[PDB]
Design a protein around this ligand. Structure first.
Ligand code: SAH
Ligand code: SAH
Ligand code: ZN
Ligand code: ZN
Lengths: 50, 153, 357, 47
């Protein structure tokens, strides 16, 4: 079902909006550990869109 | 000549240039009373200038009153509705071979729909233009032209 | 009326499905020097040339405002989404992502977007007031809310008796010639007596309005979870056009919704204030879809929208956000949208973190 | 501070792109904790 979709479709049909918002907040806050700040942000907020 | 000057001349001569009589096309229609040259201003379809969004509310209104809609699309934003308030241009029949043609002009910022003459029109001729009505699913035409589409739509 | 062939205007043609990935073949690669557009990295000058500002209201002369569900935005060249680094030993490691475009907005701050006004709508950037001449019309701001709670104001500078502005919110699908509440996707207030107008229906569940009212507008929509309960994906459309003398971008907007079932966004509401004093709740039932603050003009109405950092009677909430904040939030979001679309078309693969944010 | 796009390109976009590749290739059942782990462990090569 979800794995049979093309690249554009599956990668769209799964995850786009969090990148949309998290990359935004990452550019807004300008943290010293950008990759690590994103990692902390996501490991805190894993669940509530899924 | 200036479109304003030409328009003033047209509004001055319109009352004596054209008439309305019994028409072999259908009922009553616009006939030429003085030889009209090609491209010159025949008549304004004068009426109530409204915005497009208000058309339907008017139309349904007339649909509630059993009064026929006399509306011509100026553009995507404006319409001259002549149902309640208009001029003699409400009696111009259509022909598949028109000696006239509708054009929108801009005078002092306001748009006027003027039927001009596709050709040199002579006295007595009935005035007809291309309504360009979209194809519906059917109004038979009796314009008499050999090229007649048999239907406006 | 011809066939599934070349576009309706020979001025510019986008690559059809049979001509897939056909980039807009507008201006040629051979450019002139110009000088005015030769800005470098050392200079400090905003490339988005705002027009000359005039105290009397004016008209954007060569902007084809939205129509037929077709959104129209400013464009800038942006020859390279910046990814330049040193020449790596592996010549097949990085991807330039040459979108050759961006949604750069001709605005110093989040203001009333000129792209979404009617041709009968005049603006004065001395106060960014909006005015009209015949009947009603509608204008909207640059930003648009999708979640959270936020707040703005409208300042009224002129209200004669034959002058009645209307102020509120409206979702896309809102015909900007209609008086901000003629459809079910718009909820406003009439500035004669405080009267909530929606679906062209007027309701007196409201306070009274004053001629010199500096009115505050608070509005809280739930997170995109309760808004969609599903994927809020934002796959964007981008089309390049070269109008008479300037480049612009076209995108596909939403279609007229036949929604007749009531499914209010959970815990969403709208509150109205007169100079900060609570005029009360306006609409608790709020349909899904993004909303934006909007202003409707009657004959010669003078009103203006205003953000938070220069406020007069602001709420002290730590959660609500001014107009400017959500504005740059949405701007950065659409920047990332361009990033992701150029990624999709340019480099294989995509990947996003643990979904929740 | 760089502009939005340039800053994100210089800070997160390349490791993002390699994560893009791996997510498009292997197609895991739970990509959520997949990128969690990936952005945590592969950060050292782009810090
Ligand atoms: N060429 C044509 N073929 C068929 N019907 C025509 C026609 N031209 C005009 N008509 C009919 O005539 C009507 C004109 S409205 C005018 C009514 C009537 N002729 C009168 O003078 O009082 C239209 O509703 C249309 O149905
Ligand atoms: N070719 C045609 N076929 C059917 N109706 C026509 C027609 N050309 C004009 N009409 C009529 O023209 C009207 C719109 S304008 C009215 C002009 C018409 N000569 C009149 O005397 O009133 C319609 O109601 C329609 O009835
Ligand atoms: Zn005919
Ligand atoms: Zn005919």
């Amino acid at each position: 079902d979800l794995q049979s979709l093309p690249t554009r479709a599956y990668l769209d049909q799964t995850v786009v909006p969090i990148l949309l918002q998290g990359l935004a907040v990452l550019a807004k806050e300008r943290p010293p550990n950008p990759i690590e700040f994103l990692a902390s942000y996501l490991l805190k907020n894993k669940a509530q869109f899924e | 000549l200036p479109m304003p000057m030409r328009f003033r001349h047209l509004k001055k001569t319109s009352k004596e240039a054209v008439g309305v009589y019994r028409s072999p096309i259908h009922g009553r229609g616009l006939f030429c009373k003085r030889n009209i040259d090609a491209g010159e201003m025949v008549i304004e379809y004068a009426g109530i200038v409204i915005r497009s969004i208000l058309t339907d509310k008017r139309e349904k209104y007339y649909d509630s009153k059993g009064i026929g809609c006399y509306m011509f699309r100026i553009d995507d934003s404006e319409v001259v509705d002549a149902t309640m308030h208009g001029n003699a241009a409400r009696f111009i029949n259509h022909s598949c071979e028109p000696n006239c043609y509708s054009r929108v002009i801009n005078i002092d910022g306001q748009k006027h729909i003027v039927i001009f003459a596709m050709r040199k029109i002579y006295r007595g001729e009935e005035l007809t233009y291309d309504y360009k009505f979209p194809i519906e699913d059917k109004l038979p035409c009796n314009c008499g032209a050999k090229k007649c589409r048999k239907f406006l739509n | 009326k011809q066939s599934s062939a070349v576009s309706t205007s020979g001025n510019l043609n986008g690559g059809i499905a049979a001509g897939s990935s056909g980039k807009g073949r507008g201006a040629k690669r051979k450019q002139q020097d110009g000088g005015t557009t030769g800005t470098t990295k050392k200079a400090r000058s905003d490339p988005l040339f705002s027009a000359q500002r005039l105290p009397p209201h004016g008209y954007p002369l060569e902007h084809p405002f939205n129509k037929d569900g077709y959104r129209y935005i400013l464009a800038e060249p942006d020859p390279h989404a910046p990814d330049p680094e040193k020449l790596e030993l592996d010549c097949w490691a990085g991807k330039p992502i040459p979108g050759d475009l961006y949604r750069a907005c001709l605005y110093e701050r989040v203001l009333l977007a000129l792209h979404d006004r009617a041709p009968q709508l005049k603006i004065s950037d001395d106060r960014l007031t909006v005015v009209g001449e015949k009947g009603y019309s509608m204008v909207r701001a640059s930003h648009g809310v999708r979640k959270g709670a936020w707040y703005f104001e409208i300042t009224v500078d002129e209200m004669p008796p034959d002058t009645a502005a209307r102020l509120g919110w409206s979702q896309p699908l809102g015909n900007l010639q209609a008086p901000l509440g003629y459809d079910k996707f718009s909820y406003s207030w009439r500035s004669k007596k405080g009267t909530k107008f929606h679906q062209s229906i007027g309701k007196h569940y409201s306070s009274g309005y004053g001629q010199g009212d500096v009115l505050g507008f608070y509005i809280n929509l739930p997170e995109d979870t309760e808004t969609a309960k599903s994927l809020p994906d934002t796959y964007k459309d981008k089309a390049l056009i070269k109008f008479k003398s300037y480049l612009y971008f076209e995108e596909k907007d939403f279609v007229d919704k036949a929604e007749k079932s009531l499914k209010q966004t959970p815990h969403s509401e709208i509150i109205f204030y007169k100079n900060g004093v609570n005029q009360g709740v306006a609409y608790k039932d709020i349909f899904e879809g993004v909303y934006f603050p909007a202003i409707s003009l009657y004959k010669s109405c003078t009103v203006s929208i205003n953000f938070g950092p220069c406020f007069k009677y602001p709420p002290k909430d730590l959660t609500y956000r001014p107009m400017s904040d959500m504005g740059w939030g949405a701007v950065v979001e659409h920047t990332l949208a361009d990033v992701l679309y150029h990624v999709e078309t340019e480099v294989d693969g995509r990947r996003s973190p643990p979904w929740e944010p």
